[PDB]
Amino acid sequence: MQEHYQPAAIEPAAQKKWDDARISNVSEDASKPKYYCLSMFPYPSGKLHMGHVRNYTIGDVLSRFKLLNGFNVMQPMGWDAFGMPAENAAMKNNVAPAAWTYDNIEYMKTQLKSLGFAVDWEREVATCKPEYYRWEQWLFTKLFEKGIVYRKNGTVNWDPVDQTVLANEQVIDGRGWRSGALIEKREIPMYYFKITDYAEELLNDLDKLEHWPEQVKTMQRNWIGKSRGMTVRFAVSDDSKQGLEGDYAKFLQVYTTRPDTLMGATYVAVAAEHPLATAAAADKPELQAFIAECKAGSVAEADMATMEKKGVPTGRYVVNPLNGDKLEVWIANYVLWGYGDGAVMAVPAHDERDFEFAAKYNLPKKQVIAVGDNAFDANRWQEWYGDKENGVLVNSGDLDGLDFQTAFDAVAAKLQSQGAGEPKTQYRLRDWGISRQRYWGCPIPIVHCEKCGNVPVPADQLPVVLPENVVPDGMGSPLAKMPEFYETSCPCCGGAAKRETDTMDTFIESSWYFFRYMSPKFSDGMVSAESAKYWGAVDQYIGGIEHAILHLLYARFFTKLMRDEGLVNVDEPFERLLTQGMVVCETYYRENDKGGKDWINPADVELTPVSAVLKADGLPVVISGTEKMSKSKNNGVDPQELINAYGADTARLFMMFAAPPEQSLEWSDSGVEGAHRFLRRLWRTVYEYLKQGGAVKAFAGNQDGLSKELKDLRHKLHSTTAKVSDDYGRRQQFNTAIAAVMELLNQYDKTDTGSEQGRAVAQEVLEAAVRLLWPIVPHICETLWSELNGAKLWEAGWPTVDEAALVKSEIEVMVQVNGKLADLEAAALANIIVVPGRLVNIVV
Numbered sequence: 152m153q154e155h156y157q158p159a160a161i162e163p164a165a166q167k168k169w170d171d172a173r174i175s176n177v178s179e180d181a182s183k184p185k186y187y188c189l190s191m192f193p194y195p196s197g198k199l200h201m202g203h204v205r206n207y208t209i210g211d212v213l214s215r216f217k218l219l220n221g222f223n224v225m226q227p228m229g230w231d232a233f234g235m236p237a238e239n240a241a242m243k244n245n246v247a248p249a250a251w252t253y254d255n256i257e258y259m260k261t262q263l264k265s266l267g268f269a270v271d272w273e274r275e276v277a278t279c280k281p282e283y284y285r286w287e288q289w290l291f292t293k294l295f296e297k298g299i300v301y302r303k304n305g306t307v308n309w310d311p312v313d314q315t316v317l318a319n320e321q322v323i324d325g326r327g328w329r330s331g332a333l334i335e336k337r338e339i340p341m342y343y344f345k346i347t348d349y350a351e352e353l354l355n356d357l358d359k360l361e362h363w364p365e366q367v368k369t370m371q372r373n374w375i376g377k378s379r380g381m382t383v384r385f386a387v388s389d390d391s392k393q394g395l396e397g398d399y400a401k402f403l404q405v406y407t408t409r410p411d412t413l414m415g416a417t418y419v420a421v422a423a424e425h426p427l428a429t430a431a432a433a434d435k436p437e438l439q440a441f442i443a444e445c446k447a448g449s450v451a452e453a454d455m456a457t458m459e460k461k462g463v464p465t466g467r468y469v470v471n472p473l474n475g476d477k478l479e480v481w482i483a484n485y486v487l488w489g490y491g492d493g494a495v496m497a498v499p500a501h502d503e504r505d506f507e508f509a510a511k512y513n514l515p516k517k518q519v520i521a522v523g524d525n526a527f528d529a530n531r532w533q534e535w536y537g538d539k540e541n542g543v544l545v546n547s548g549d550l551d552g553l554d555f556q557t558a559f560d561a562v563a564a565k566l567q568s569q570g571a572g573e574p575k576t577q578y579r580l581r582d583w584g585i586s587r588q589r590y591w592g593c594p595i596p597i598v599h600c601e602k603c604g605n606v607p608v609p610a611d612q613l614p615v616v617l618p619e620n621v622v623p624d625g626m627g628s629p630l631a632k633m634p635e636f637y638e639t640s641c642p643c644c645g646g647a648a649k650r651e652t653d654t655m656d657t658f659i660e661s662s663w664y665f666f667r668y669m670s671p672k673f674s675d676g677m678v679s680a681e682s683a684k685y686w687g688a689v690d691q692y693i694g695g696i697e698h699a700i701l702h703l704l705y706a707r708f709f710t711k712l713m714r715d716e717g718l719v720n721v722d723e724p725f726e727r728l729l730t731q732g733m734v735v736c737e738t739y740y741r742e743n744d745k746g747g748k749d750w751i752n753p754a755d756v757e758l759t760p761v762s763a764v765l766k767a768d769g770l771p772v773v774i775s776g777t778e779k780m781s782k783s784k785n786n787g788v789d790p791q792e793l794i795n796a797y798g799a800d801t802a803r804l805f806m807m808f809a810a811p812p813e814q815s816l817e818w819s820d821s822g823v824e825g826a827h828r829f830l831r832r833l834w835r836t837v838y839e840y841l842k843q844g845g846a847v848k849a850f851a852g853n854q855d856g857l858s859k860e861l862k863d864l865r866h867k868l869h870s871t872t873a874k875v876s877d878d879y880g881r882r883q884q885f886n887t888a889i890a891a892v893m894e895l896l897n898q899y900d901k902t903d904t905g906s907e908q909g910r911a912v913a914q915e916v917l918e919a920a921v922r923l924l925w926p927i928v929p930h931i932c933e934t935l936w937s938e939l940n941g942a943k944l945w946e947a948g949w950p951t952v953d954e955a956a957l958v959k960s961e962i963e964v965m966v967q968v969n970g971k972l973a974d975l976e977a978a979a980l981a982n983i984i985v986v987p988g989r990l991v992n993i994v995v
């Protein structure tokens with residue numbers, strides 16, 4: 152055994168030892184219990200970043216842990232390969248997105264291997280390969296013929312200078328983020344998944360997910376946004392009917408979740424596109440301008456609640472069907488056409504958004520709910536105004552004194568009796584639009600024929616292959632300019648036809664890849680029935696919180712779609728979910744020509760603990776604030792430099808020790824140095840133990856007759872094993888597991904293990920510590936284990952707790968005062984000559 156720890160000598164040998172043994176190449180062996188540990192697969196962007204290393208180390212700790220406990224562990228990896236990065240890189244470097252992607256994949260694969268992740272590389276997938284995406288084209292066609300996928304005109308943001316469609320996030324004050332040109336709202340046909348048909352199942356099945364973080368479940372509930380409320384029709388006043396046709400001349404229909412407060416409605420509000428808005432605006436330029444500004448808006452959903460709410464009165468009136476109040480119709484920017492009826496009622500006393508709106512425009516506020524003896528203040532919002540549970544009705548006529556549920560039913564009865572309303576259930580969830588006007592994506596398997604319509608491509612003809620011999624130029628989607636791709640014949644009639652040129656939302660590939668890993672080379676379906684039956688669901692999913700809503704909802708949706716197609720048996724893809732925190736790092740700047748700030752990467756910096764300077768010249772730079780690593784402020788630390796400098800095990804240890812997985816991880820040079828030094832300590836501890844005697848049979852069995860000091864070390868040992876096991880398998884906090892092993896080694900350092908029984912206990916401590924740490928730092932632990940013991944580490948398995956090592960000594964002594972029934976003198980007095988060990992006599 153070499154004296155000094157050298158990661159570059161031992162880490163490749165260890166990786167070849169694991170590959171040669173094929174520990175990670177698993178199959179559907181019905182003998183061991185399966186365990187499917189999955190980390191969210193990466194975009195092949197070019198290189199790993201520190202987020203990648205954190206995620207996949209966390210996955211590897213859990214996978215190796217379960218492996219050591221006798222599970223048949225599948226830990227697969229692959230490439231979410233489609234999307235915009237390759238297209239932009241194609242425009243920058245004038246290369247093909249496919250070629251750029253396959254080079255990135257090959258480089259990033261090497262980096263993953265070098266980190267020693269116990270990954271089943273025989274299950275690798277690359278979603279840009281036809282052998283992958285053909286199966287989502289297949290599923291598309293089946294759902295399309297069922298109407299679960301459908302085509303319909305939608306509205307997009309067109310940038311006329313960049314010639315591409317932009318999301319609301321990419322529109323800044325009505326203009327494209329890169330071009331700066333005013334975007335144009337354009338209606339175009341697009342494809343949609345009818346995800347709303349699965350809304351109730353997607354909502355209710357969250358209750359099955361006892362091992363999901365409650366905040367992720369809450370986020371999905373709010374996103375789905377089910378509500379049980381009331382349709383209410385307010386008759387249009389006789390004086391307000393000019394310009395209206397059909398039912399819009401007869402009544403204004405709204406949806407409310409608070410029909411218990413219908414007595415306190417003080418006005419109503421409609422969307423800009425509402426017919427009442429159009430009729431009122433017909434002769435009022437201020438309304439036409441307000442309608443125009445509403446339509447031109449591009450507010451993102453994550454910002455919808457943070458926008459300034461504005462309205463204009465229309466001079467039109469409707470009648471409350473329960474009290475006869477004549478209420479004015481306002482046009483408001485927060486009422487969305489297409490949500491419900493595009494028209495709401497307002498109760499400023501009991502809805503906070505209505506309270507702020509009314510307060511802005513000095514509109515009436517009518518209290519109709521009371522909660523205890525709390526005073527109602529029409530000029531200040533108190534949180535109890537909106538309480539649904541503990542309130543009773545007031546100022547509501549014959550409805551007074553009722554609670555929410557009884558008021559709901561009474562209003563429902565009153566409205567239904569006179570035909571003015573009925574209970575209704577709504578969802579905020581919109582259908583899923585999957586059409587992208589981009590090249591580097593999965594082709595949509597639709598052929599357009601003027602005789603036959605939009606025709607799904609037959610299963611025989613799938614895939615529709617995306618040509619990879621393309622370099623996008625940034626003047627429109629290349630597929631639309633490629634007659635060699637889109638000119639085809641109709642598969643129903645054989646006539647002249649055109650392929651769809653839009654490609655799929657790349658969320659589609661990540662919505663089912665966890666099933667494809669089960670049988671990645673299966674050529675007769677999305678996933679083979681034998682392999683889906685064996686692996687079932689993912690037992691553990693690990694990934695960033697930014698995917699807590701869309702990706703997970705899409706994946707749960709696809710799983711239920713595939714179940715209903717008979718491809719899988721589960722209702723839910725992910726049993727346990729762990730969400731890792733961000734990786735943050737200090738930023739460094741040095742001002743330049745125009746009173747601004749230029750940003751320097753941390754690896755090109757050296758500190759003086761005073762100030763910092765550039766490593767190349769030694770000239771100062773300004774130390775700035777800490778934030779998530781990104782190209783924005785040039786503060787991303789390349790993990791490849793971390794590996795080159797210290798080795799994979801140090802990288803893995805620093806990530807797991809620095810913070811709990813959910814907590815943000817702060818980059819720290821001293822922290823990285825401390826991780827490496829601990830590995831040197833571990834190395835020297837085993838080396839020094841073997842230098843004074845070599846290996847012995849580890850202590851096992853009855854520990855009677857062991858000295859107090861060695862019994863104490865065995866106690867620390869098996870409590871540490873218990874602590875670590877509970878940290879890996881239950882708390883999923885690996886930092887405290889590392890600290891616990893560090894405490895074991897501390898006590899070992901203070902224990903004389905020189906005797907024959909001492910060496911036996913020392914062997915037992917070390918054999919346990921290297922296995923307890925092997926999930927985190929497998930290369931050095933594999934090497935150290937081979938110096939201590941000849942068995943296969945993974946066949947020795949996870950350390951067992953010896954309960955007997957946790958029972959402490961006992962000795963019953965009789966208490967007697969005057970003859971009748973330091974250490975023991977204090978205990979017996981808690982109930983004086985002492986006979987050692989048997990009796991204590993209290994001279995009374």
Ligand SMILES: CC(C)C[C@H](N)C(=O)NS(=O)(=O)OC[C@H]1OC[C@@H](CCCn2cc(CCCCO)nn2)[C@H](O)[C@@H]1O
Nearest residue numbers: 191193194200201202206231661694695733734780787
């Ligand atoms: C399943 C599909 C939809 C996944 C999709 N292909 C994807 O997100 N791919 S990915 O390649 O972007 O990320 C793959 C994983 O690992 C990384 C995690 C990052 C968490 C955020 N972060 C970043 C940083 C700074 C890093 C250093 C910068 O110099 N700090 N925190 C992801 O959340 C995800 O778990």
Ligand SMILES: [Mg+2]
Nearest residue numbers: 358359360361
């Ligand atoms: Mg259950």
Ligand SMILES: [Zn+2]
Nearest residue numbers: 600603641644
């Ligand atoms: Zn045809």
